[PDB]
Amino acid sequence: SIAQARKLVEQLKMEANIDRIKVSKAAADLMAYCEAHAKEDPLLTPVPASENPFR
Amino acid sequence: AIPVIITAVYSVVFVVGLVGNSLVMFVIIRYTKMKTATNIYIFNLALADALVTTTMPFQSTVYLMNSWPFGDVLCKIVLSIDYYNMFTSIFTLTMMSVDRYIAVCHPVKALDFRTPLKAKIINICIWLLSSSVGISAIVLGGTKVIECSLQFWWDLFMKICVFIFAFVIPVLIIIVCYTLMILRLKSVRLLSGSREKDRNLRRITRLVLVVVAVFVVCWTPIHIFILVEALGLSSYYFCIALGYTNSSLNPILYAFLDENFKRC
Amino acid sequence: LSAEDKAAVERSKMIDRNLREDGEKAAREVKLLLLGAGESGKSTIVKQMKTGIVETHFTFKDLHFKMFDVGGQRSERKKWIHCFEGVTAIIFCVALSDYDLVLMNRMHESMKLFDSICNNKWFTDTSIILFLNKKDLFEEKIKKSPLTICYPEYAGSNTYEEAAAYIQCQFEDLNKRKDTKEIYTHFTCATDTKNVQFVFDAVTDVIIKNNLKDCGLF
Amino acid sequence: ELDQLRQEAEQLKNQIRDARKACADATLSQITNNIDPVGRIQMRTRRTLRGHLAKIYAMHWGTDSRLLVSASQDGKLIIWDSYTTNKVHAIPLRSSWVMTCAYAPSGNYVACGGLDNICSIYNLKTREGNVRVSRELAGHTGYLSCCRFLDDNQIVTSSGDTTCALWDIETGQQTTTFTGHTGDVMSLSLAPDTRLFVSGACDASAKLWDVREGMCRQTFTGHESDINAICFFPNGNAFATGSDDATCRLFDLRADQELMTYSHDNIICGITSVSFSKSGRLLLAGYDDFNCNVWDALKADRAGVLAGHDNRVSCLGVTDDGMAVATGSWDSFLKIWN
Amino acid sequence: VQLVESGGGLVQPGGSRKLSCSASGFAFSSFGMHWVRQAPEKGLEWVAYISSGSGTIYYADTVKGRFTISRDDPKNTLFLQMTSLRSEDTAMYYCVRSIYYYGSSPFDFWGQGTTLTVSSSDIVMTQATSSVPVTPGESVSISCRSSKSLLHSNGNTYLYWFLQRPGQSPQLLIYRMSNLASGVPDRFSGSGSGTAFTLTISRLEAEDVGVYYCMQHLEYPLTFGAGTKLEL
Ligand SMILES: CN(C(=O)/C=C/c1ccoc1)[C@@H]1CC[C@@]2(O)[C@H]3Cc4ccc(O)c5c4[C@@]2(CCN3CC2CC2)[C@H]1O5
């Protein structure tokens, strides 16, 4: 009862003091990662059947 | 215009049989996979019926012109394939009746018996047994107003043997198996419950009666006429048309009355 | 295909043959899901029918049975109940002697569990074998404690037959859409060895229905 | 002081909510609105793997991207060759109720578990020609829903007892236990850097854990029903969840909040499995409506549908080079798509 | 894992004898097994092969129609029936286990070997070098040649390397070129392309002194190569 509530409070305090960046920056980082690896994505860009191990 | 009516009936039944066999094969190959024994039996029966229907136009031509112009080479092949596929279809539907009887009246044993491997083995055995008659006909079906016939008291013995191994034995087996299956199903706790399931039990009984009555009423006249003619004119080809109607309407009726097909 | 490729294909064919044999062997066995409350009595049912989940194997009249006891799974049942969706029958055990017991009422808790299991979307057509265990305790307690403690609208004779029939009817009334699945109710005590035959009869009926549906004829 | 502690917890939760609200000036939709979307994803069944005679519950690709292990409820663990479509191994399991399977990154081991609350490690490469179990990891009081190899000697397993554990396969004892979930944990996802993992639970909450210390780092709460699948973005700073309310969501570890929602009005069935493409551009999700959907992660569009399964799609995985996608399903068939 | 061969001994020419090999320590039923013989002064030579489940059997052209190979999986025994033995059939016979799946290592374990003495389009593998003098601790290279390209369309080059220490059975070093076998030190390396192959040892001790053989597995009858002796 008391112990569980104290543990929950401590966990909430530990998770409260966490550095956060802007959502715009994180979205830009995700978009940059997606665009930087778009060439090496066979499902995104279909490969020619010569270089396709499943043909 | 009796010959005109008979020719129209022959054409209609040939078209109906070809369409029904094609549809049944299409459903077996595409809609419902042939993984169960019932589907394998249905496919084999449909193939036999299709082959019989393709054989029928030669009989239609013989009726139309009262002569055989195809020659001995075609006559032997046609006669052999006709006999072999008649026996194949009859034996396949008899085996389907036996399989249903085993499924209902022997449910514990049907677990290790009604397997697709066993169904394939039984179908191949039926194919070999009928190919025996086909081979016996491919060497004796010579031509002798030339008429394509099984060249030889030998003819009477052959006709009696065909009647014994094609009509009475299969009819008796089918009747016994289906009667026993219905009697067992009458005592089950799921079909024999309320009015909602007594209706399903009576529907099953009606389907069994329909199948047996169709087989009997479409195979009796031709066999009776052929047996009588051996001991002793336009009704011959009518009876042959009745047999062809049996072959054509077996798969169509089976598909129309199939609950698994109705659930797809 | 090289020699090594051909040998690999041959090994795969042998694996396929073994898998087919295993599947054929497994299709010959009857699977039963054992359910009920903790004190409802399943250990006696398990004994008479011979962490994680417990598998029980027994054979009766050339029929092989697999019984799965899931009473040790202290988790949320909605996440693993579909693992038993394809099952021959469900054996539900209810102690009918705890109508006056207090865990709310134990009998009402068993009724709620039966309602949840019977009307589950994974067991729409799965027949349920209902065992109402602890018969003689119920008989001995029906003389003193009336059935009005559990059912306030009983209004019936305080005899074992009428009360037991009322309990059975109340349990089978929870079977919504009683047109595809059948509930097999049996009254069993601790010293009563007839439940294996009852399970075999229910399973045989289920098998007849199953291969009727297999034959495209139902 | 119980009421005081509850008030303090509520105040801390509100503080966290407003702190993570302040750093949400923009949305993922606006940033990716001007970018070119995926034209049309059209994959086809290159291979079909047959041999399982019951529902498939889990699959895992090998690191070499050619072998894959499949778990099905017929008691069989099959290792396939996705190129030639032939079976390399067939492992019989002690308990047929298996809900998860894993492939070691080295390829020497596979893992599986289920209603037995046990993770079993199988040695694929022995002096003998057979596959044998090497260790059985007991200690979970609920069913095992996921397991992922850290290395040849460490594995992390989730369980339905509201607890994830870190094991040492050398000794068989869980070195660390990750508690904090109030519901059954259904999925796991190790980060590419392997130093932390996320876990979705039936309490509609996802938690990020530290493997070294053994404590929760962040908690994400945006779903309405149980979280069924969780996957890690290839970057390592994001993860996607697949829940029972027919909605996928994307969370950012740095932003500590949900980024974008993947749902459609005509889909009312829960998501059973999620996975990402190699670049993270395509989010692939298996559903209860018998087909697998392909979402564009940046814009939340239905790029394509992997229809072709006759039952619920339970498992779903992409190769390490992104060449193929394998989907298992309750119709006992695995399908490789390109 | 051990394979023990039984039989052999003095046989009059034109007679017959049965060779038996007892397998213990591994799943004998899941392995394809080979018979390989080595003449008293010459190199190894493949004889016969029986697959797993006995569904595939191959013989050498020298023994085809004369030898018979069979296995007894419940008894864990491999048999070789040979009739009408010629004077060229005298050799020490080895039993080899080889399992075939993706990533497998065939020919990994060889038996002790039994000897039999009788009283009085195939791919060609070449090993020109022989009797190479070697100083311990140095680096040596052993070359190989093939009459046909061993590189298949799978991308696999079926070129096998074996070491035969004096008085010891041959042991696998590299199964498909550039694949180090289990239990073999990292000093050994495999390289090559097409029809030319090389085996390299960075540093060596007195242990790896003996005859080195090259084998092709692209197609039967599984021809070997002449020995390349290393002398200290
Ligand atoms: C005397 N008789 C012949 O001479 C056959 C001449 C042919 C055969 C192909 O083309 C000309 C008969 C004519 C009729 C028939 O065809 C007919 C039914 C039947 C029943 C009992 C017989 O004893 C018998 C026949 C044959 C073989 C099988 N059929 C089956 C098709 C589906 C209905 C044949 O034997």
Author numbering:
A (entry chain G): 8 to 62
B (entry chain R): 57 to 200, 207 to 214, 221 to 300, 309 to 340
C (entry chain A): 5 to 54, 182 to 234, 240 to 354
D (entry chain B): 3 to 340
E (entry chain S): 2 to 121, 124 to 235
Show passages lifted from the paper.
Upon agonist binding, opioid receptors activate the Gi/o subtype of G protein family, initiating a cascade of intracellular signaling pathways. In this study, we present cryo-EM structures of the KOR-Gi signaling complexes bound with U-50,488H and nalfurafine. Overlaying the receptor regions of the nalfurafine- and U-50,488H-bound KOR-Gi complexes revealed a close alignment with a backbone root mean square deviation (RMSD) of 0.4 Å.
The cryo-EM structures of nalfurafine- or U-50,488H-bound human KOR-Gi signaling complexes were determined at 2.76 Å and 2.9 Å resolution from 858,423 and 1,225,096 particles, respectively. Analysis of the cryo-EM data from the nalfurafine-bound KOR-Gi complex yielded four different maps, the highest resolution of which was used for structure building and final refinement. The major difference observed in the ligand binding mode was the interaction of nalfurafine with TM5, particularly K2275.40. Key residues, including K2275.40, W2876.48, and I2946.55 located in TM 5 and 6, exhibited exclusive van der Waals interactions with nalfurafine, while no interaction with U-50,488H was observed. In the KOR structure bound to U-50,488H, the side chain of Q1152.60 engaged in a weak van der Waals interaction with the ligand and formed a hydrogen bond with the side chain of Y3207.42. Conversely, nalfurafine interacted with the side chain of Q1152.60 at two locations, establishing both a van der Waals interaction and a hydrogen bond. This suggests that nalfurafine forms a stronger interaction with the side chain of Q1152.60 than U-50,488H. Conversely, structural data from the KOR-Gi complex in the nalfurafine-bound state confirmed an interaction between the side chains of H2916.52 and W2876.48. In the nalfurafine-bound state, when the interaction distance is defined as within 4 Å, W2876.48 directly interacts with the ligand, while H2916.52 shows no direct interaction with either ligand. In the nalfurafine-bound form of the KOR-Gi complex, the side chain of W1834.50 underwent a significant shift, resulting in the formation of a hydrogen bond with Y1403.34.
